[PDB]
Amino acid sequence: SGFRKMAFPSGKVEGCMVQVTCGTTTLNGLWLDDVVYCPRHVICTSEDMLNPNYEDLLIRKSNHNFLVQAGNVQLRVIGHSMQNCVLKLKVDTANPKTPKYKFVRIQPGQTFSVLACYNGSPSGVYQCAMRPNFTIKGSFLNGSCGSVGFNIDYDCVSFCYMHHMELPTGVHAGTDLEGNFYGPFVDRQTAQAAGTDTTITVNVLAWLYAAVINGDRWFLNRFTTTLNDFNLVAMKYNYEPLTQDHVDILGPLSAQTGIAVLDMCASLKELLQNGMNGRTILGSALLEDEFTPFDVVRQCSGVT
Amino acid sequence: SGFRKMAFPSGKVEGCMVQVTCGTTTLNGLWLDDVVYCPRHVICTSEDMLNPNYEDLLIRKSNHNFLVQAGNVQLRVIGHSMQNCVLKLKVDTANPKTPKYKFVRIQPGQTFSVLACYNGSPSGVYQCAMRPNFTIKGSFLNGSCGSVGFNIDYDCVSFCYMHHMELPTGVHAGTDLEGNFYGPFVDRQTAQAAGTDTTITVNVLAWLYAAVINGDRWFLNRFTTTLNDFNLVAMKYNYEPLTQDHVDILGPLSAQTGIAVLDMCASLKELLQNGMNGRTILGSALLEDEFTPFDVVRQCSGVT
Numbered sequence A, B: 001s002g003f004r005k006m007a008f009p010s011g012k013v014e015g016c017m018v019q020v021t022c023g024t025t026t027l028n029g030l031w032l033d034d035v036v037y038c039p040r041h042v043i044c045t046s047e048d049m050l051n052p053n054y055e056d057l058l059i060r061k062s063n064h065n066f067l068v069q070a071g072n073v074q075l076r077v078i079g080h081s082m083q084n085c086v087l088k089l090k091v092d093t094a095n096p097k098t099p100k101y102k103f104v105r106i107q108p109g110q111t112f113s114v115l116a117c118y119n120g121s122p123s124g125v126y127q128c129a130m131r132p133n134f135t136i137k138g139s140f141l142n143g144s145c146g147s148v149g150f151n152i153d154y155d156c157v158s159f160c161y162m163h164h165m166e167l168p169t170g171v172h173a174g175t176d177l178e179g180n181f182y183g184p185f186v187d188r189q190t191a192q193a194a195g196t197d198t199t200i201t202v203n204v205l206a207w208l209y210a211a212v213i214n215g216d217r218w219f220l221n222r223f224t225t226t227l228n229d230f231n232l233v234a235m236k237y238n239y240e241p242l243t244q245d246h247v248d249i250l251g252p253l254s255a256q257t258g259i260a261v262l263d264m265c266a267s268l269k270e271l272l273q274n275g276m277n278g279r280t281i282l283g284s285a286l287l288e289d290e291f292t293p294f295d296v297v298r299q300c301s302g303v304t
């Protein structure tokens, strides 16, 4: 029993992290086979911030202008190209520690693990959700760009995020590993705003199931509701509408606990309208929305 | 910016995890050089658990009663012995992935990362604190015994915890890697109770500094206090006394924010006496006590 913010083991990703330096600028890269992927803003200076001419900046760069180090050991760059907002540096040594991997794009509300790195050295691992406004509430400092987010599906590492920037509101934005931003963001220093965020309803319901599995049941009465009645309340509290698909994905948790999905919706409706009245659920005094149904299963079942 | 529950990168520990089977009973082991360490209750059956006579059980077994697997490769056992509550199985091959390591015994209030494993396969990593009552609030299912906790100091893995059992209250108990339990617990299935738990004051103060660094400042007041005055309030609310060494460990956070520790104590005193009033600190409606001053520095400064 117990429930924690649990990340995937990070070893397979740690072995792929490198440092990329161009001029005075250093950030992280992801070394897979004979290519290093990193944010293309490594080729910028301060003069280029508002309107970087990335093609111009890259044409002026040779392979020798890129300094790639793995564990502070230099790899030699033998080619360079741009894909969207990512630079792809071909190196003359393939990474013998490359895991089976895929590049995936995650959907809003889904979670991933982030390996926070500085100067090619991993600092820590934590769990993040892609918010409905396509930002993440990460933990990143200067030097962290090129850190990646990932999930492990079976034995495949599914890379889904590469870190690029922090908005003034303290949230984070980045790309998939093909260099396309999540959300309405660009890698130039225009003033950019995220949309109003909302609460990920299906994930709150999943977390309430995790509480029931762990014995924290005080919020469970034998109440039930309809999907439409629940959504009329959810919207008053800035919760995402619940669809029948979301109901379907909660099936395994409903199956384990014996609590129908719309009964849990009724419990959540009561928690929203009346509050938690000083009580905690799974150690939190707020309703938590960064655990997916799969996250709860995997933690409450022991998948490896 | 940002602040998450962040674990250490787990790759150096992943390479040490093995599966140990004795008859029908399987759990995890830690493979370092040519020794595998695991909980000694692997040698037990149902009737042993009231009062396992572990010396008898161990001496009557042969090396061939132990099946150790690193992935799918079998490691032949060439000796078996017991140190306190840990079994040491000498194997015929040294682990080629053995990191620099130490076995350390951590003090109450300190944090560590847990690599939760099943059948020798890592499943996830999360951060834990040793509670003042010498239990941990972990996330463990059947098959997780032998999972370890650790910190990474420089490039040395400091192993501090190996998982053995769950108390009826839902909290967890285990040993250091010398096989000595934290707290008064024993590896017998008997009614065992943890003493009252208290809140780790120095950690709450570190988390309030993390909040200020991240721009949450509403709870700051203009007052100061003394260690003696504050400690009268701490004991009213079941907080651990604050020591001068705790004040000094907070100095790096005081230096970064310009808020004296005793000023922060005065702010915490008001939070304990009035609560939060439907406001939040770092996205929580409770005072969080599982981040040490170092965890905040390491995260808010980018230690790798």
Ligand SMILES: *[C@@H](CC(=O)OCC)[C@H](C[C@@H]1CCNC1=O)NC(=O)[C@H](Cc1ccccc1)NC(=O)[C@H](N)Cc1ccc(F)cc1
Pocket: A025, A026, A027, A028, A041, A049, A140, A141, A142, A143, A144, A145, A146, A164, A165, A166, A167, A168, A172, A186, A187, A188, A189, A190, A191, A192, A193, B001
């Ligand atoms: C990574 C840059 C790096 O490591 O390379 C050289 C050391 C860094 C990460 C953030 C710093 C602090 N916390 C972070 O998450 N990113 C930047 O500094 C980023 C560079 C950039 C990226 C894309 C367009 C323009 C500049 N700059 C910023 O994050 C600041 N906040 C400026 C900014 C940029 C874009 C916005 F929409 C708002 C604000």
Ligand SMILES: *[C@@H](CC(=O)OCC)[C@H](C[C@@H]1CCNC1=O)NC(=O)[C@H](Cc1ccccc1)NC(=O)[C@H](N)Cc1ccc(F)cc1
Pocket: A001, B025, B026, B027, B028, B041, B049, B140, B141, B142, B143, B144, B145, B146, B164, B165, B166, B167, B168, B172, B185, B186, B187, B188, B189, B190, B191, B192
């Ligand atoms: C690990 C055991 C394992 O993997 O062996 C393979 C068959 C497991 C971990 C707990 C399972 C569910 N969540 C956990 O954390 N440990 C046990 O099952 C443990 C075995 C044991 C260990 C030491 C003395 C006696 C039995 N048994 C228990 O944890 C239950 N809760 C019984 C118990 C034991 C000791 C106490 F103080 C209170 C309750």
